[PDB]
């Protein structure tokens, strides 16, 4: 059974995906963007009241097999939208003028892995020629500054960045469906964990976007909202000012396609447990994260 409390395995993710769907289908519609190197389909909830021509903020969270609290972040996501819609008067605006893209986990095969083999599996599970060593790291397969800094051209490291930018299904599914509905998607949000930050584009080259002062200013706004639950500390910029060199990032070419609103948060903790984040602080994390996703929801809304 699923919970929202809990890390559900990918067979129950997918089950939920499929009910919650059908429990509220005024507020949700399911549909695969693309299959896994697996096989496996890779659901997408578009969440919201149906309406002419609105405008869309595109959500994905399991880029990283290990990253499980970002899983339960997308459900919980969900979760909040199913429950607050008339109940509350942010979350009923936001569904009624936007629709949320949400890409519960997007790394399926990997995420299956971490639950029947390696609870530090972090890439995709597709082979690579001339070695054993298995799969890419989606988050260094896009077509942004491909495979140059902070991008191993070794594919049995943990930053492969592939054969070829999109050379996974999984991104190229991905690219496909936000170049499919780039004239609609206004923000990118990417949920990962650990350490705590609000980051935002360039972490493939040292340079700034032009919205960097309006991304700084609504970052500084997102991390102070995230802290008022909890006390929850975040840090916050540019990768090129506040991370090592990370070419082929999503964040980075979704705002590269000209989507000004692109973010990557990398949830609890600072290290303490790392990527496995007792399923006692979901309920916190979710909650806390919220604030922040609100925040930026309730942004993009107002500078359409
Ligand atoms: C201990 C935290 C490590 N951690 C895990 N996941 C991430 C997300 C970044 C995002 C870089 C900007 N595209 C990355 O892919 O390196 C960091
Ligand atoms: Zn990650
Ligand atoms: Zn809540």
Redo the contacts with the bound molecule.
Sequence with gaps: GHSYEKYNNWETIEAWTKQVTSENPDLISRTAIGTTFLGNNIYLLKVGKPGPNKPAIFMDCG??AR?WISHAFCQWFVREAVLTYGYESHMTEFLNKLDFYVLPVLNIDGYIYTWTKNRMW?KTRSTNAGTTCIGT?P??NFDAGWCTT?ASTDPCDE?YCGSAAESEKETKALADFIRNNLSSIKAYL?I????Q?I?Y?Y?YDYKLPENNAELNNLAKAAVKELATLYGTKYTYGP?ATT?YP?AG????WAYDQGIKYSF?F?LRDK?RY??ILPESQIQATCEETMLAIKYVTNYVLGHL
């Design positions: 880029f990283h990253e972090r790291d988050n260094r902070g930053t990417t990962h964990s650990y350490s930050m980051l584009p972490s990768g991370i990370a990032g999503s964040d980075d990557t990398e290290g790392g990527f």
